[PDB]
RNA sequence: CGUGGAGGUCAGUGACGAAGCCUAGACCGUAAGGUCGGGUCGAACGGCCUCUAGUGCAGAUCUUGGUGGUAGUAGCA
RNA sequence: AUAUUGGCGAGAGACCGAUAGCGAACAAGUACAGUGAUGGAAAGAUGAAAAGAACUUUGAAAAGAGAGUGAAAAAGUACGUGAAAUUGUUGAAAGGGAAGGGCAUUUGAUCAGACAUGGUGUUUUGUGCCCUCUGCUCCUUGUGGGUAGGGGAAUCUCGCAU
């Protein structure tokens, strides 16, 4: 298989190209064919999100700014095509550091308070993208005829965002939120000049305590419409989200604005990030960008990670259904991704890419890269020979 | 420091323990190579272990002397078991590489053993001697 | 049957130990004749130790790490209602640490609160000796820009030296792992850079397992090949947690006893 | 009846009950007002019985009728009290008229203290502390000594000083 | 709950009766269960274990490790699992002892008694 | 709580008559029963005897230096037998309970309001 | 007040360390003794209402086992 | 129908738990003693698995030292826990032909000694189980309980957060 591993400490892309079964931290068993260093830009302008558009080319997001068209190209160096990264395009300055600085006067804990992208996606074969930074801005950057990059529109968001995600289940709409930020559905226009708030989400009653409920959405997956007699006014769109509240919460709009089901997935309220959907036989279930193809939330099974070691599966009802490489995996988890439906693309602070099994739970591939990564995406699985 | 220290050990060892113990603390805080000098010499006859605690019907001797003490003897059996000892304890430091001259016995220890027979165990830890040591203004 | 068992095999342990070395001294005999003999046994029988047997960037260097650009100033504060052994502790960092001002921690001003302090009076590090009882067990340097954090504990502390105003050398050993390096990288940044020879002074910080142990001696040359070398300073064991990586918002490594299983490794 | 029970709990076995080393009674049955036991001051014996319980933080006055003697299903009908302190102990008194002047300041005092556990809140919202208690199990306290005392013996600090004061002050001379 | 008067509930009787049991006992005493693909196939849970069959290690410190039984020590109540294998300090290998109510078959060595013992306990091969 | 100044009578153990010349004789109190012992006849000089006028205030009984009623505690259900005597009664976390369930009882306790009379037992940081 | 076992109960405690053993450690009980901290340990155990007995030791030129002073003494013909 | 400390074979116990229980839980009517009839003990527990300490080195041997296996050798075929008497070493203290004990205190050594932090009364706001609009559901007597969708603070301390 083939990886674009995404490095901070050197600032660059290291590309993973091995076999099923390659282990690193073992001497006698398999090697990786080829590691490889591309665009080393240094720390401060390390690759936040990326996108891989097609065989040949592949758009990248930097922490400097800097929005990049990439072109892929291969050639031989057994038998094994390696590749080459060549910048076509940047568009640059797409940051506003004053909105966070400012907003954050101990919000919780972060000193320096570094603004990144929080995703990278295409709007719907359109050569058109879009680009969230974490201080409520929203670039949509097209890809010209010319293969060269132009931003569109520049558009705003109330901070601060943490994940935003797109609605691409036809049956333009996103949702987006952060810290002491609900969840609120906005509409795009096709000229994509006018955003337009349509809903936005009601805190859960109090606890035993009578404190308000912390809320901090980390992730957000978007389900195919609630079937029935369909409310006016009342919109449908159905979703679940994660926390940093341990609060695994799922929204029926045709229900209400308030989530009909706030679970808590792990006692004491630890943190966890990054919601995944996968399925329980190794199977496709959702659309590019990760959203759920059904109108129930029990056919829902959710991967994500805390910031200890570990690495969660949950269900639609907030069961644990096991961890995730409880062994191998010693440090946090940065980034994951249930790539295919029937693999998991996992690699955090303990400087290791590993490719999981779905179905059986099993580590494929370790690979020792050297440097912190903060994301991995699969180009292709086809084995060498 | 366990650094700057080695230990021989004998055990189960048919010796009188009277007798080992007057040889044990006579040779206690001295030098390797004084030491060592020492029990050939008590073997030879030109010197006698100090004896303190056992010591009835002792015939006292002039070379007793040199510790303050009457009651001498030499215990020529005792005195084998313990340079034996010695001998391999400065072979332990060698094995370890610690320096020979300024070796010296800290903590020697002799207590009984099970029974008739009266048998002892017999433990002796020799460590450097560290000065070594210069200023500056 | 212990009785029969008790006779058997101490008569089979006499009966070894008589063999083993008859063996030997005609070992020893045939070695007097031709030297090597012994030398291909060497070769062959290996004395198998632990370490034998072990189961197996310059833009960072300034980000998350203090360099020989500024004095690096330490922000030395205690853990709440701390006992005299811990200000007795806080007087032996406030020699071998560079400039350490200590703060007297008075309740409240909870993490990010102390954080925006040492912005505006514009501190380094934070370090922090915490107690559980009358001895001191734990010590947490943290990098206050962005936060690369380490905890460890303290399992030795024994007090003859008496040192200088002079400051002293650093020496750092077994960091092939680069987690190790990263912490050989903390001690490398909050410990002074200035080494001034004359004094005499060295701060070592051996680590030949998981335990890193710091040490002062006073070194003294004779031109015949050899050093001497006097105890001086806190004698001192410290065991690597966390790496919190944010302020105290993300993990690294965080130690637990599932490790000790391996017997080797060595982070 | 009622005395027949209390004879054969007050001995012959309350089954439920703590005899503290000061000689006193304590019944842990879940519904009594006073933790301590004593005639009329448990639940059991008593037919007439009130009490404050919290099952969330709701705080609600339970109170059981001699009327349901035979179906114990129902026995413990209850009231939630509002929330504020003083239209609460209003509330109490209303519930307790033509009672036992014992249950009407008992459960006024139920409530009092049950209002006050209600400072848990004010030590988890200015928590952020620090610290966390951390268990010392034996295996580990071995693990941890008799390893770092094979590691001082394998370690040999000296030779290494001595071996990289040499090598450095060759190459820095 | 016992009925039967013919067996006994004791302690000390049972414990003699499994530590003083002969070699043809100790071979049913010593039982591996089948794997759920094998129980799926042949219809039955558990089976006696012999040398030439396939098995896969659940519980224990050798955990997931799989291999083909060498020889079943009946008289230690052990079986020795070929590359699940201690290494001495001498460079030798002394095989682990394992119990094969921890053990699960995978791959059956069927012979024509192997066959008719599956036959009887209601099994299609 | 404002309690009376607590007056022991006698703070020194009661110990046995030639229980420190020899080792066999117990430091546990036991009378002297020969009609020719002194101790027994109360002889000045000789040790003072257990007596009821050493006998504690019925008000300050059971009192430790804190004013607290002494009271062990197992669980969390019998710690919470002590929510209206927080001022008379202290929880001591009886010794065998284990280290992972004490961190769950001086949570409790801390918000309850209850003293402990032994925490920091098992429990480093 | 304490010990071995029995019935009942505490949905008791317990490999995150039961029982035992120590401890220049602390508290309670006039006391018999009870409770707790620390150290050592490795698998069961305790409070409460009752039952039952081969149940509580300083002695008996007590029985058994172990260990001293005598003593490196008398002694080895 | 009745007897039964033997034999053969079971099923049990408010029994004993290794100085107990049969003399014997083990090379026990054995070792051994007596001319002989007979008399007749002591002695259980490494671990989960021997993984029983390879290999270097000290000694003719007896035992040690490095090093390693194991969760633990702080479990070594002297092997689970390892008490007291008693013995050595080290440290502290005391000692002019007696010590130990009781009452009281000094000196020396030493251990305890809060993850205690508020409480009350006002004032910004911001939320909710609060006001208000619309409900749904368990049951027993009014003095009920649980639980949704919207709105709203310009009234309201009703609670909790700043």
Known sequence: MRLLVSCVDSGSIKEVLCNIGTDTSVQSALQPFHVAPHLAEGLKAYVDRMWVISEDEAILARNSGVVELVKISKHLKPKFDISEFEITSSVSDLFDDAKLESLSSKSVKRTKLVDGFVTLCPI??????????????????????????????????????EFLQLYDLEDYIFAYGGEENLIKLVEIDSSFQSLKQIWEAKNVKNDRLDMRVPVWPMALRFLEPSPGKTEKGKLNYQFAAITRWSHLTKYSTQHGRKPFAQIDLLPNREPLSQMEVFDAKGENVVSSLGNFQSETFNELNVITTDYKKNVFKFDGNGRMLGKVGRDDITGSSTYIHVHDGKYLLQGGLDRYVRIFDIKTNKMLVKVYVGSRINFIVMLDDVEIE | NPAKSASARGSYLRVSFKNTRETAQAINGWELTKAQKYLEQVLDHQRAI???????????????????????????????????????????????????????????????????????????????????????? | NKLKRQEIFADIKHEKNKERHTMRRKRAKEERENPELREQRLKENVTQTIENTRVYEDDLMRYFNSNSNEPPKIFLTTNVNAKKSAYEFANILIEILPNVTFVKRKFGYKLKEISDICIKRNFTDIVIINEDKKKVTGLTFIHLPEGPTFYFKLSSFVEHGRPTSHIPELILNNFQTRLGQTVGRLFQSILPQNPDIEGRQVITLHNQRDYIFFRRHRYVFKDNERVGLQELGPQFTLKLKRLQRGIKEETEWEHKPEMDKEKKKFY | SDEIVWQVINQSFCSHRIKAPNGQNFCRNEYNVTGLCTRQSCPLANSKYATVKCDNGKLYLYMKTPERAHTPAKLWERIKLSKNYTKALQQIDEHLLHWSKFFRHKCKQRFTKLTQVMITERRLALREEERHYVGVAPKVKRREQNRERKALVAAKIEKAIEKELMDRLKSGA | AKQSLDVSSDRRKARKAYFTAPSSQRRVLLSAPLSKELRAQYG??????????????????????????????????????????????????????????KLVITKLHLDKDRKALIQRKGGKL | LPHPKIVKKHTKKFKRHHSDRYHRVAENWRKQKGIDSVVRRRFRGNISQPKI???????????????????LVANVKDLETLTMHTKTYAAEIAHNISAKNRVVILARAKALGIKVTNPKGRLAL
């Open chain 2, 50 to 137: 100090p004896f303190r605690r056992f010591n009835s019907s002792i015939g006292r001797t002039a070379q007793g002397k040199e510790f303050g003490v009457t009651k001498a003897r030499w215990p020529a059996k005792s005195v084998k078991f313990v340079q034996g000892l010695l001998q391999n304890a400065a072979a332990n430091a060698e094995a370890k590489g610690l320096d020979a001259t300024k070796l010296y016995v800290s903590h020697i220890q002799v207590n009984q053993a099970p029974k008739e027979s009266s048998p002892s165990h017999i433990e002796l830890v020799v460590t450097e001697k560290e000065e070594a040591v210069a200023k500056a203004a």
């Open chain 6, 53 to 71: 006028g050493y006998g504690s205030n019925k008000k300050t009984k059971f009192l430790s230096p804190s004013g607290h009623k002494t009271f």
């Open chain 1, 124 to 161: 719907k074969s359109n050569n058109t993208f879009v680009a969230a930074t974490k201080s409520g801005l929203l670039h949509i950057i097209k890809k010209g005829e010319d293969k060269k990059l132009i931003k569109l529109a520049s558009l705003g968001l109330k901070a601060p965002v």
């Open chain 5, 44 to 101: 039955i849970k558990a089976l006696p274990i012999r040398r030439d069959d396939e098995v896969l290690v659940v519980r224990g410190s050798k955990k997931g490790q799989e291999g083909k039984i060498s020889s079943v020590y009946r008289l230690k109540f052990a079986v020795q699992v070929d590359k699940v294998t201690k290494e001495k300090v001498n460079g030798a290998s002394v095989p682990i002892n394992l119990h094969p109510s």
